[PDB]
From a paper:
Toxin EsaD secreted by some S. aureus strains through the type VII secretion system (T7SS) specifically kills those strains lacking the antitoxin EsaG. EsaD is a toxin secreted in a T7SS machinery-dependent manner by S. aureus. Here we report the structures of EsaG, the nuclease domain of EsaD and their complex, which together reveal an inhibition mechanism that relies on significant conformational change of the toxin. The major contribution of this study is the discovery of an inhibitory mechanism in the toxin-antitoxin module that is based on a significant structural deformation of the toxin, where the central β-sheet of the nuclease domain of EsaD is split by EsaG into two fragments.
To investigate whether EsaG contains an IDR domain as most of the other type II antitoxins, we determined the crystal structure of full-length EsaG at a resolution of 2.30 Ǻ. There are two EsaG molecules in the asymmetric unit, which interact with each other in a 2-fold symmetry. Even though gel-filtration experiments indicated a dimer state, chemical cross-linking of EsaG using an amine-specific crosslinking reagent EGS (ethylene glycol bis(succinimidyl succinate)) yielded no cross-linked product. Density gradient centrifugation analysis also supported a monomer form. The structure of EsaG contains a principle four-stranded β-sheet sandwiched by αA’, αB’ and αC’ from one side and αD’ and αE’ from the other side. We noticed that, except for three residues (G50–S51 on loopβ2’-αB’ and E162 on the C-terminus), electron densities were observed for all the other residues of EsaG. Similarly, BH3703 is also well structured with only three residues in the C-terminus missing. This suggests the absence of IDRs in EsaG-like antitoxins and, therefore, a distinct toxin inhibition mechanism in Gram-positive bacteria. Except for subtle movements in some loops, no obvious conformational change happens on EsaG upon EsaDc binding, further supporting the absence of IDR in the inhibition process. In contrast, we didn’t observe any disorder-to-order conversion of the antitoxin EsaG in the structures of EsaG and EsaDc-EsaG complex.
Residue numbers in the entry: 1 to 49, 52 to 161
């Protein structure tokens, strides 16, 4: 199996997982995974046939138990971590972030970024809010968070 085949297998597994975590019909799906040496996290938003829907709200609104959803969540994270370990296994610079987007109409985008988030000294919420501001046009709901988004913006501009 080549590198492309490994990437493809993992991508397919990821897509199937994320689709399995959504109990209803979805239109667009935006997934983000921040993984470095100091742990990491995975989150995704999904639209319905528009408004973004945050993944951790799925068990609250729909009939899927917290336990099952959290299990599938952990499996997804494990998939992304395996994806990074592949990059390591092929003597490539390990990515620090991965965007995994796909739509109901077959659109697909997988991209990697290598921002040194550790030395940025910003936490997961800052990274998430900044991501939501960059990808979409959504700004946070408190001035503290907004200010942090500006700080991260300026940190990145100075790279």
């Amino acid at each position: 199996m080549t590198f492309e085949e490994k990437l493809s297998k993992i991508y397919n597994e990821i897509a199937n997982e994320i689709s399995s975590m959504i109990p209803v019909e979805w239109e667009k799906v935006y997934t983000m995974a921040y993984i470095d040496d100091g742990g990491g996290e995975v989150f995704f938003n999904y639209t319905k046939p528009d408004d973004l829907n945050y993944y951790t709200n799925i068990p609250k609104e729909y009939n899927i138990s917290v336990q099952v959803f959290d299990d599938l969540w952990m499996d997804l994270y494990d998939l992304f971590e395996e994806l990074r370990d592949l990059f390591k296994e092929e003597d490539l610079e390990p990515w620090t972030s991965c965007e995994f987007d796909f739509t109901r109409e077959g659109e697909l985008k997988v991209s990697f970024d290598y921002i040194d988030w550790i030395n940025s000294e910003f936490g997961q919420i800052g990274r998430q809010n900044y991501y939501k501001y960059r990808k979409f046009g959504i700004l946070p709901e408190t001035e503290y968070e907004i200010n942090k988004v500006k700080e991260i913006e300026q940190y990145i501009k100075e790279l």
